[PDB]
Amino acid sequence: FGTNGFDIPTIAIALLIVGVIIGLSGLILSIFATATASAISNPSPGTLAYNLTHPLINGMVSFFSFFPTLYVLLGVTGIVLIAAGIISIIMEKF
Amino acid sequence: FGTNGFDIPTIAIALLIVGVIIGLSGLILSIFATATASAISNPSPGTLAYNLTHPLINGMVSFFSFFPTLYVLLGVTGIVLIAAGIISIIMEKF
Amino acid sequence: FGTNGFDIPTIAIALLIVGVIIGLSGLILSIFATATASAISNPSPGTLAYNLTHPLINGMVSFFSFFPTLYVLLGVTGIVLIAAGIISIIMEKF
Amino acid sequence: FGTNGFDIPTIAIALLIVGVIIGLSGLILSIFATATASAISNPSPGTLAYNLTHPLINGMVSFFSFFPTLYVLLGVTGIVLIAAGIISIIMEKF
Amino acid sequence: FGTNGFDIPTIAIALLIVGVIIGLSGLILSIFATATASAISNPSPGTLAYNLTHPLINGMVSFFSFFPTLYVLLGVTGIVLIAAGIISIIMEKF
Amino acid sequence: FGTNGFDIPTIAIALLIVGVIIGLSGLILSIFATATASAISNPSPGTLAYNLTHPLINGMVSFFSFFPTLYVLLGVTGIVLIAAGIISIIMEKF
Amino acid sequence: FGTNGFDIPTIAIALLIVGVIIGLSGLILSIFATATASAISNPSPGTLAYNLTHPLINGMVSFFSFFPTLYVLLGVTGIVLIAAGIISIIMEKF
């Protein structure tokens, strides 16, 4: 059901795979982050350990804050492919 | 029942396959999302785990919100193919 | 699901791997830093041992302060790749 | 009763085997856990033995809490296989 | 009584075999589950044994709840085969 | 019941083995720790024997405190394998 | 009266043998347990002999409590064999 490489069943299967992979990624990261939170403690506000550990958790927070826009762009990517497939069908179906 | 590659039984079979694949995709994603919801808990509004986990679920929500337009475009795709087949039949049947 | 080398499932897997690796790195460094803090003591403000040891912990603090910008740039890196993939798709999909 | 490797009697036998194996696993683990609970005592809240033994039972509780999602995913696995078999039948039966 | 591989007596025998196998599976699982229920006791709501045993029975309940949709899909599978056989007969009987 | 190496009965047996091994480990360590607690006495707070013995029990406490995160990660490991098996099934079942 | 190894008279003889063996086992164990009960006395609640003897009778009670589920599973075993024989007959009698 297509012309050259655009196949609607293939697109549906690809969406299935992408959705399930993202679900697994979210599940695994969320499970692991709880273990991280449990492991690290809060020594004191001003002792040596605080100076040793604070920037690491700051980087954790920053990178985990950068993920959401990555996911948004990854979601936006598919609409471009679908529109390109539609346009390619239109171009030489007539 | 056609001219070159447009076959009405083939179109019906293709619609059957697309519908059943989309049904399976919806079923599997809906089943898996319940397990995800059960697995992740709500630690606290302001502790370390919240900062570690919140953007991930934000990305989950965003991507799952992007699916509906993908499905709408995927549905729109078929009408173009059917109309192109009709026009191709008309062009050289007479 | 792509054109030449841009594969959305591959991108999702890469994000999974990067996230889990960063989580392991943060966990290991945070665990080890507590052992470092426990091991080193505070001899006195002005004796020989203080002169012998202070610049080392100063370098510890400085380098651990340099990590956060490294993590920020590492996070920024991925958006460039995703945008480049989108542009590459757009260039020759039409 | 199938096309290449999808056999409904074989699927039924596989479900039988999986169910009976899970039943045996639950029975054996539940029986053994009672013996574990009987064997370990509660020395005191703050003596040496408590410090020596508490994290072990904490790990017991954690791992036994991780089983339920493992079972849920194991159950979800079969629906994917059945749907794949149905789709494979549909693809080349017509 | 058929054309290539579609044989009505063979279909009837296959339905017989599937029905009897499902009957045996239900009988065996139902018999075994009573023994499981008898074996496991209820220690207390909050002692060590409860923490040790509760998630296992939760997984039991979940997986046994996942069976019904598996059976429903297994039943749906046969109609597809019968319809495919009918269509295959129609295609080249005329 | 699988495609290449993913076998649901094998997964169930593996979970059985892992659970029983962890149960035996917890039981043996808990039994032995009571004997350790009984054997070592408390000489005095400041005599020679205290200086000779205290860091050893400190290391005991520390290592036994490190076990819980080891168990948590060991539990997390299985979900990755199950998700990978599901994804591998999805990839080439269709 | 069978196909390869399933013989109804043989099955009946096997059931006869199993029943008579279980009857003999129950009779012998019940007779011997009375002699055990007669032989052991009750010295006192707190003297040396009580500490010396109580766990042994506790183990007696526990093991004799484990027999019933063993008998239940042994009884369940035969239904599986009979159903397997029926299915094997059905498979190649037609």
Coordinates of C-alpha atoms in Angstrom, one line a residue, chain F:
Chain F
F1 CA 7.5 -19.9 22.7
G2 CA 9.8 -17.3 21.3
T3 CA 11.8 -16.2 18.3
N4 CA 15.6 -16.7 18.8
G5 CA 16.5 -16.8 22.5
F6 CA 13.7 -15.2 24.3
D7 CA 11.7 -17.9 26.0
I8 CA 9.0 -17.0 28.5
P9 CA 9.2 -20.3 30.4
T10 CA 13.0 -19.8 30.6
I11 CA 12.5 -16.3 31.9
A12 CA 10.1 -17.6 34.6
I13 CA 12.6 -20.3 35.6
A14 CA 15.4 -17.7 35.7
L15 CA 13.3 -15.5 38.0
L16 CA 12.6 -18.6 40.2
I17 CA 16.3 -19.3 40.5
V18 CA 17.3 -15.7 41.2
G19 CA 14.6 -15.4 43.9
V20 CA 15.6 -18.6 45.6
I21 CA 19.3 -17.8 45.5
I22 CA 18.7 -14.3 47.0
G23 CA 16.5 -16.0 49.7
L24 CA 19.3 -18.4 50.6
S25 CA 21.8 -15.6 50.6
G26 CA 19.8 -13.5 53.0
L27 CA 19.0 -16.4 55.3
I28 CA 22.7 -17.5 55.5
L29 CA 24.0 -14.0 56.1
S30 CA 21.4 -13.2 58.7
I31 CA 22.1 -16.5 60.6
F32 CA 25.9 -15.9 60.5
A33 CA 25.6 -12.2 61.6
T34 CA 23.9 -13.3 64.9
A35 CA 26.9 -15.6 65.6
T36 CA 29.3 -12.7 64.9
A37 CA 27.3 -10.4 67.2
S38 CA 27.4 -13.0 70.0
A39 CA 31.1 -13.7 69.6
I40 CA 32.4 -10.2 69.8
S41 CA 32.1 -8.5 73.2
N42 CA 32.5 -4.8 74.3
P43 CA 35.7 -4.5 76.3
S44 CA 35.7 -0.8 77.4
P45 CA 35.5 2.7 75.9
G46 CA 39.1 3.6 75.8
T47 CA 41.3 0.6 76.5
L48 CA 43.7 -1.2 74.1
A49 CA 41.1 -3.7 72.9
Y50 CA 38.7 -1.0 71.8
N51 CA 41.4 0.6 69.7
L52 CA 42.3 -2.8 68.3
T53 CA 38.7 -3.8 67.4
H54 CA 36.5 -0.7 66.6
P55 CA 37.5 0.0 63.0
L56 CA 36.8 -3.7 62.0
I57 CA 33.2 -3.4 63.2
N58 CA 33.0 0.0 61.5
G59 CA 34.0 -1.7 58.2
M60 CA 31.4 -4.4 58.9
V61 CA 28.7 -1.8 59.3
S62 CA 29.8 0.1 56.2
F63 CA 29.9 -2.9 53.8
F64 CA 26.6 -4.2 55.1
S65 CA 25.2 -0.8 54.4
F66 CA 26.5 -0.9 50.9
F67 CA 24.6 -4.2 50.1
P68 CA 21.1 -2.6 49.7
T69 CA 21.9 -0.5 46.6
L70 CA 23.6 -3.6 45.1
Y71 CA 20.4 -5.5 45.6
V72 CA 18.4 -2.6 44.1
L73 CA 20.5 -2.5 41.0
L74 CA 20.4 -6.3 40.7
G75 CA 16.6 -6.0 40.7
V76 CA 16.6 -3.2 38.2
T77 CA 18.7 -5.3 35.8
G78 CA 15.9 -7.7 34.9
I79 CA 13.5 -5.1 33.6
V80 CA 16.1 -4.1 31.0
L81 CA 16.4 -7.7 29.8
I82 CA 12.6 -8.1 29.6
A83 CA 12.1 -4.8 27.7
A84 CA 14.9 -5.8 25.3
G85 CA 13.3 -9.1 24.6
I86 CA 9.9 -7.4 23.9
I87 CA 11.6 -4.9 21.5
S88 CA 13.5 -7.7 19.8
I89 CA 10.2 -9.6 19.3
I90 CA 8.5 -6.5 17.9
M91 CA 11.4 -5.7 15.5
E92 CA 11.1 -8.8 13.3
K93 CA 7.8 -10.4 14.2
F94 CA 6.2 -7.9 11.7

